[PDB]
Design a protein that fits this description.
The structure is a homotetramer. Chain A has one domain: Beta-Lactamase (2-Layer Sandwich). With 137 residues, chain A is α+β, with helices and mostly antiparallel strands. Chain A has four helices and seven strands. Chains in contact: A-B, A-C, A-D, B-C, C-D. Chain A binds chain B through residues 13, 15, 74-76, 79-82, 84, 118-122, 124-126, 128, and chain B through 15, 74-76, 79-82, 84, 118-122, 124-126, 128-129. Chains B, D: InterPro entries: PFN, PFN_euk, PFN_sf, Profilin1/2/3_vertebrate, Profilin_CS. Chains B, D: It is found in: Cytoplasm, Cytoskeleton. Chains B, D: This is Profilin-2.
């Protein structure tokens, strides 16, 4: 019912270490996120970079999510028949990189970070399905 | 009971130049394909490379479809919650490349080749959607 | 072509008739299986199906290609659904057949099952195609 | 993650006054259900009546869910392409009847009771969708 339950739904199958529902329109802030993760720290400026008119800048300079440096693998956020972005965190102190997927609905963004080893396709479709569901709703 | 029916409905929105339904189990061959395209010439050996246990050999050496040299962008064919593969044809003398998507249903493979400029995400969800429809209709 | 979707619905063999009919601007049969009553669905009949009056057809019934029918369940505009469970009427010594309507964006998927084919089978058949057309 | 979360998923959109996930095979009992409702009281005997070989007895004598007398509107639990039952409670002390839908997955039953005025179609598809989802998993 609440947005936290939507995060619960995303975290249910166990392949995500974190999940979040983030507004990108007139309620541009984190609606709900996994407690204690980095998504709780996603800023309005970071959201702008994700949904911005410029779809080439993030490929050159990357982007941050909750101040976590990431790289863009594929941008399909505004392409025909899709509404996703495949991202991957940058490895720091020997840590493994993590896949991230964004699903864009009409008012919010579905963001998921996979646990170590989880494939981008799994996250892509997870993000896609909830985005589509929110769109009909 | 015609699979040529499905390829027609894949060619509707006009973003594809080719479309095909290809088996990868008992009926390892093209069931239906765009007339005049390379998908029409997909050999059993090629189907094997697509659905094989080896999910690294094609990234290293690429794969072919109807003999056309291609590269694998992403493999999500057997990964949790997905059933697609993002492919892209290679250029010989500067000609435009074309994105390709594979959608794995029960015993059938949905394969679509986009026109110039059509994004992989578009084709990925195009193949994904038809595969999902086929799976749900067990 | 829409005639591709109707011949698609005839694949599994549980149906004796299938059709794609418009209910908005293009209010007429787009495609139908040849030799059946569905080819003859009129705009007046499409109006009853998709009408604002969701009680009229229960009291007096409805017709598809002039075939007299009774509405079992109306889920066309209800939340989470987009179907209608119909059943043709017997005009004497004839077996009845179930019919299901699936409402997509601007189209209407209509399927008539053969004798013995249960309504739930047809309901999900229409539901699945309507869902595919919607998501796509 | 747990079973109560699946119940939470079913209750999210607000059209259900109650929801539950009930095992019908080797773990034939309520796995999770809405706190304080009637589904919490679903017995193994009631479960057997729902999934039993006899698909006609319940139309004649009705059936109970948590001791609550109900009637069967439609049985599609084992028909081709479907996996649901459309049930409806019987009105007692002037109260309104409530629609109920049962969706059958491989090992469990998705059961939902609509609020006053909620249509059978809504519950039918809600139950159908989660049962199909559970099936993709088991």
């Amino acid at each position: 019912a609440g947005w936290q339950s939507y995060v619960d739904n995303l975290m249910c199958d166990g392949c995500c270490q974190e999940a979040a529902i983030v507004g990108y329109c007139d309620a541009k802030y984190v609606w709900a996120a996994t407690a204690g993760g980095v998504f709780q720290s996603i800023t309005p400026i970071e959201i702008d970079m994700i949904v911005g008119k410029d779809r080439e800048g993030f490929f050159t300079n990357g982007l941050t999510l909750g101040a976590k440096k990431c790289s863009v693998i594929r941008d399909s956020l505004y392409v025909d028949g899709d509404c996703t972005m495949d991202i991957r965190t940058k490895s720091q102190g020997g840590e493994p990189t993590y896949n991230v997927a964004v699903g864009r609905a009409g008012r919010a963004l579905v963001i998921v970070m996979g646990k170590e080893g989880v494939h981008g396709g799994t996250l892509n479709k997870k993000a896609y399905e909830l985005a589509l569901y929110l769109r009909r709703s």
